[PDB]
Nucleic acid binder design. Sequence first.
RNA 1: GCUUUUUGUUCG
Length: 148
Amino acid sequence: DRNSVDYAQIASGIDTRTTVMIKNIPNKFTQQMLRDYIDVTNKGTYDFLYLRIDFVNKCNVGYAFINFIEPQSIITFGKARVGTQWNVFHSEKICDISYANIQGKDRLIEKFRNSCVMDENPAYRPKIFVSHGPNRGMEEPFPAPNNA
RNA sequence: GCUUUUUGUUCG
């Protein structure tokens, strides 16, 4: 209901949400393969990316999270991938998306900066990329923790 | 044939 993606509301500017859940991902798909998968259609249009990893079984958990700098980049990705199979690892999964429950790079940094997922391998951690300017799209170090 | 489905306080 609430996390349903409607491309007509993105295009009309009613729904200004930028964080999206990338659901139904092959479990042996990696952070590199996902960045590459997105970069086909949406190179430099996103400023956050997090593919959740099972640290014990050493493979993704079936979903990822991406934040688009502009909501209209959700139509570009959505129209290209939603409803399509991945063609890797004999997986019959089909790509799908929905809005994320945590919206925005600032809110996502708040959440992840003091997390124990930041203490793991960098390929297992959430990543961020410059949102605006001539450095737009370049990977940035994640803001350090601020616990007590 | 390849898997966790709204983000690890639970390490599966």
